[PDB]
């Protein structure tokens, strides 16, 4: 498998907002799908977020299909900026041993190790080699050789036998004998990213490429260590390799390291708690060096009797304190600090992790300063290959890079004798540079963190340097990254909020969060809640909001202090609803809440400074949330919509609340939906009795609720009364049959207010259709809309419908789909020919029609005078049907305005016919892309 493609596909998709992602899924579905994808259930695709969707595509579809599917879709959606990005890329002991022991077991064979820096891959390889030496491994390993790109990048051309025997001269006499047993040799290549005859002299790159290609000693064993950045080349070089991933320390090992370093249980546990309180700093604690830095700093502060709480609040404070605590007092080494910053910047830009004495000389780094640089633990000298140096850890290098950019620039520095490999602020903050070099993202956060004033003051006082004051403006000059004029995706919002929190200056947040108009949030831990609370309180024009809480934020229902901190932060966070008086739409979905949090949220929602106008709840746990929400939303003057869905059982308390919500006299509701509610016929009877008093409700949906047809008959017998007030009504998927249709016909004939209806997903049957049609025939019928999508109707039902329509009815809208009318299609065509028809719209999406029947539709369309829209999809009339329909309709200019069907625009004759029809009927719009596999829903009807 190739981890590269999955990573590239994931990062692109996460830049899409909610609106664009929905279109992307629909457009992909219309794309020619490979046979494997179709087996997937469409429900899962809808619920999958950005990250999962990439996982689904990579695990089932061919590589080439993914590349062309992504590029084509983005180009059509007109996201030009993303298209360019896509095309460019698509073109101490007892612990390390504990980790390595389990790591080693996951492993001619080609093995590749990859992981983040500082996780200890070199220790793993050296442990394997030592085990070979100590006979710990199998005896089959008789010889092993060590090759390091850290050193081999400089040595000149020579023979492979000499190359490998350079460090062991005594073995050259035995090199031929050793290589006569290629099956007993192990080769290790360490640090690739830092970069046939064994007795033939050749260049080192050629030798390395040949060995990696197995052109020399093919039957040996290879083991490669590299960072994910350089993993691309091994794909073009290696043949059928296997990839292994390393992880490093865990929480338990971090605790153990802290216990070892501190010694005292109290100090160690206090420090560990203070560190873990910060999720972002905790994650970077996997690398041992970061834990070393944290322990040293906190211990030094504790021994001096200082408060450590501010230190761990954000990364930049911690690193800044450590750096301030590693140089002598009174020196004011301005020059040394500038030199170190420049060196780190150069190193980061060039993607190099090691430097030789020559490199330090090239930059004018006096070797005397190396004493301070080393004894302070900023640089670490390698003790294996002399003449090498490296930085303590990657994050420290990034921090020094940021310090370079915020440092004041001197006049004429462009006149230096070297062309430095340093960019500028705008280039640093550009997205293409981020994708090309993923190691600048962290420099971004650190730079934001250094925009504070107090930190600059302290740094200048301790060292005596001078700080550039234009950073506050340079950061905002890249404000176009934020002023996209569209709601930002979840990941972008997380990044922006994190940076703003790092800044710790509200004046920087105000100018940035002022123009937000819509927001989506996905909380996963406490730190995210704290960031959102700190930043979003300044919004004033916010108008929509979608919330979601992941498991683990709130502790399971029964630790008390751990939940108390979360409760406090939640209470602080829930002040958006009460303060902002422009918010006008909310939504909550798939949240693992707890009773106390729900109660706090409702307390804040019940105040009189909130002006909500729509609400939605979906799949929330526990199950008291629905009852509490129904209680809280009683009497809301502004509320005019409300939705509830999930799996519930009608406890008597819920029935009380859900009847009182309609009994009230302040009620202003105008639309109410219910889902997954199971109850006995008595409760339903009393509910429908309560409905009789309401004088504001207009819609009513009951999707996924069980009526058992007894609630349905009770409902109909309630509606036959002369003073009901409902107008719309929908009984989608309520376990209906033909038994109740007679009462429905009675309602239709007697009613005087009903003017819409819907019965999707119900096999009522042709007998039910017959009963309804008997109902429609009465002169005084007022129903104007009717929906019978996917109701298992046959040609007898079609005949009944045509017989009903043949009279002067009032129906104008009719929607049929899934259920098929092909054989009886001529019957409905005859009905359309009748002058008494008054239909304006008609939908026949996926009705299994054959091209032979196009004649009837053509004649009817040429004859009718009132039809104004027809919808055909998923039919087999694509070629012959197109030809015949276009030929027939070329004769007359009918009233039809919108016609939808699926076509291929690659045919010349079809194009000519379409052009002729359009020229003779310029007022007719024809949709040629009906391939969409999403049916017209019932939301409008």
């Amino acid at each position: 498998t190739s981890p590269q493609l999955e990573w590239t596909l994931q990062t692109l998709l996460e830049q899409l907002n909610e609106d664009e992602l929905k279109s992307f899924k629909s457009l992909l579905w219309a794309f020619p799908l490979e046979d494997v994808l179709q087996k997937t259930p469409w429900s899962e695709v809808e619920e999958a977020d950005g990250k999962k969707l990439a996982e689904i595509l990579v695990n089932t579809s061919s590589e080439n299909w993914i590349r062309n599917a992504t590029v084509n879709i983005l180009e059509e959606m007109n996201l030009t900026e993303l298209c360019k990005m896509a095309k460019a890329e698509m073109m101490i002991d007892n612990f390390h041993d504990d980790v390595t022991l389990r790591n080693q077991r996951f492993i001619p064979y080609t093995v590749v190790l990859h992981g983040p820096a500082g996780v200890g891959k070199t220790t793993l390889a050296k442990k394997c080699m030592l085990d070979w030496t100590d006979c710990n491994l199998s005896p089959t390993l008789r010889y092993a050789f060590y090759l390091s790109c850290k050193e081999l990048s400089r040595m000149g051309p020579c023979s492979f036998a000499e190359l490998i025997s350079k460090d062991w001269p005594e073995l050259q006499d035995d090199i031929p004998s050793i290589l006569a047993q290629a099956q007993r040799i192990l080769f290790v290549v360490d640090g690739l990213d830092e970069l046939g005859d064994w007795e033939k002299k050749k260049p080192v790159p050629v030798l390395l490429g040949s060995l990696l290609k197995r052109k020399m000693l093919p039957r040996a064993a290879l083991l490669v260590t590299t960072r994910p950045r350089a993993l691309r080349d091994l794909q073009l070089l290696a043949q059928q390799p296997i990839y292994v991933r390393v992880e490093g320390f865990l929480e338990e090992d971090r605790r153990a390291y802290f216990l070892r370093h501190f010694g005292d249980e109290d100090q160690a546990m206090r420090a560990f708690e203070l560190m873990r309180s910060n999720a972002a700093l905790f994650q970077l604690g996997s690398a041992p060096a970061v834990c070393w830095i944290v322990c040293t700093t906190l211990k030094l502060q504790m021994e001096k009797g200082e408060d450590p709480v501010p230190t761990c609040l954000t990364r930049t404070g911690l690193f800044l304190r450590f750096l301030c605590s590693r140089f002598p007092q009174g020196a004011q080494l301005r020059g040394a600090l500038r030199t170190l910053s420049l060196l780190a910047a150069q190193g980061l830009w060039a993607q190099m992790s090691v430097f030789h004495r020559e490199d330090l000389e090239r930059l004018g780094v006096q070797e005397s300063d190396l004493r301070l640089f080393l004894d302070g633990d900023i640089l670490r000298q390698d003790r294996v290959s002399k003449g090498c140096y490296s930085f303590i850890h990657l994050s420290f290098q990034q921090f020094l890079t940021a310090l370079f950019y915020a440092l004041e620039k001197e006049e004429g520095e462009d006149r230096d004798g070297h062309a430095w490999d340093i960019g500028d602020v705008q280039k640093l903050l550009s997205g293409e540079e981020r994708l090309k070099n993923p190691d600048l993202i962290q420099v971004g956060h650190f730079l934001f963190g250094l925009a504070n004033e107090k930190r600059a003051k302290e740094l200048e006082a301790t060292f005596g340097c001078r700080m550039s004051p234009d950073i506050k403006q340079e950061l905002l000059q890249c404000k176009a990254h934020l002023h996209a004029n569209k709601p930002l995706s979840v990941t972008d919002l997380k990044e922006v909020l994190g940076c703003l929190y790092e800044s710790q200056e509200e004046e920087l947040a105000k100018v940035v969060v002022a123009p937000f108009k819509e927001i989506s949030i996905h909380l996963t831990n406490t730190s995210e809640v704290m960031h959102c609370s700190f930043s979003l309180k300044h919004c004033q024009d916010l108008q929509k909001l979608s919330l979601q809480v992941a498991k683990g934020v709130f502790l399971e229902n029964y630790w008390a202090r751990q939940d108390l901190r979360s409760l406090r932060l939640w209470t602080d966070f829930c002040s958006l609803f009460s303060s902002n008086s422009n918010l006008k739409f909310l939504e909550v979905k798939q949240s693992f809440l707890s009773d106390s949090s729900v109660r706090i949220l409702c307390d804040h929602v019940t105040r009189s400074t909130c002006h909500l106008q729509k609400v939605e709840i979906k799949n929330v746990t526990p199950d008291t949330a629905y009852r509490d929400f129904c209680l809280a939303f009683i009497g809301k003057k502004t509320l005019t919509h409300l939705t509830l869905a999930g799996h519930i059982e009608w406890e008597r308390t819920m029935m009380l609340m859900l009847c009182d919500l309609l009994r009230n006299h302040k009620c202003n509701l105008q639309y109410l939906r219910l889902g997954g509610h199971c109850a006995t016929p008595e409760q339903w009877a009393e509910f429908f009795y309560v409905l009789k008093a309401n004088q504001s409700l207009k819609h009513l949906r009951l999707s996924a609720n069980v009526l058992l047809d007894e609630g349905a008959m009770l409902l109909y017998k309630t509606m036959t009364r002369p003073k009901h007030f409902l107008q719309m009504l929908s009984l989608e998927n309520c376990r209906l049959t033909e038994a109740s249709c007679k009462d429905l016909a009675a309602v239709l004939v007697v009613s005087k207010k009903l003017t819409h209806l819907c019965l999707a997903k119900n096999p009522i049957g042709d007998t039910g259709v017959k009963f309804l049609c008997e109902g429609l025939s009465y002169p005084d019928c007022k129903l104007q809309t009717l929906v019978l999508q996917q109701c298992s109707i046959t040609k007898l039902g079609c005949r009944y419908l045509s017989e009903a329509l043949q009279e002067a009815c009032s129906l104008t809208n009719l929607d049929l789909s899934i259920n098929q009318i092909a054989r009886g299609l001529w019957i409905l065509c005859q009905a359309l020919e009748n002058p008494n028809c008054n239909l304006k719209h008609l939908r026949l999406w996926s009705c299994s029609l054959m091209p032979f029947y196009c004649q009837h539709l053509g004649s009817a369309l040429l004859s009718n005078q009132k039809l104004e829209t027809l919808d055909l999809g998923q039919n087999h009339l694509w070629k012959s049907g197109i030809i015949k329909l276009f030929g027939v309709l070329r004769q007359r200019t009918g009233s039809l305005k919108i016609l939808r069907l699926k076509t291929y625009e690659t045919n010349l004759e079809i194009k000519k016919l379409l052009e002729e029809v359009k020229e003779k009927n310029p007022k007719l719009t024809i949709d040629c892309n009906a391939s969409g596999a999403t049916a017209p829903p019932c939301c409008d009807f």
Binding site: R599, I634, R652, L656, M657, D660, E686, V690
Partner: protein
């Protein structure tokens, strides 16, 4: 004797019969009226047999709400959207008693 625990609900099993969240029965004794906007109701604890649960239609109109509920800050929200304040809650002779008031609409 002051009590530091409060009920988190009060359903209406029967008219003049309320059951808290632990299925204990509370019975209202008297209703006080001082003026148009001041109403104070007195609840008492007592154990009595329970009949069939009268349904909302049978309960009919009433001055008291159908269900209370505790909210932070120590205030109850009735089912008519009005807030009720806690006056006092004491024990005398082993008998529980509570008094509640109707706050002016905000």
């Amino acid at each position: 004797e002051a009590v530091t625990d409060h009920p988190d609900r009060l359903w209406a099993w029967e008219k003049f019969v309320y059951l808290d969240e632990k299925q204990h029965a509370w019975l209202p004794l008297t209703i006080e009226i001082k003026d148009r906007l001041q109403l104070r109701v007195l609840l008492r604890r007592e154990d009595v047999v329970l009949g069939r649960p009268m349904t909302p239609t049978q309960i009919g109109p009433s001055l008291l709400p159908i269900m209370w509920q505790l909210y932070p800050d120590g205030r109850y929200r009735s089912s008519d959207s009005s807030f009720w304040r806690l006056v006092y809650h004491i024990k005398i002779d082993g008998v529980e008693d509570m008094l509640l008031e109707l706050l002016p609409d905000d």
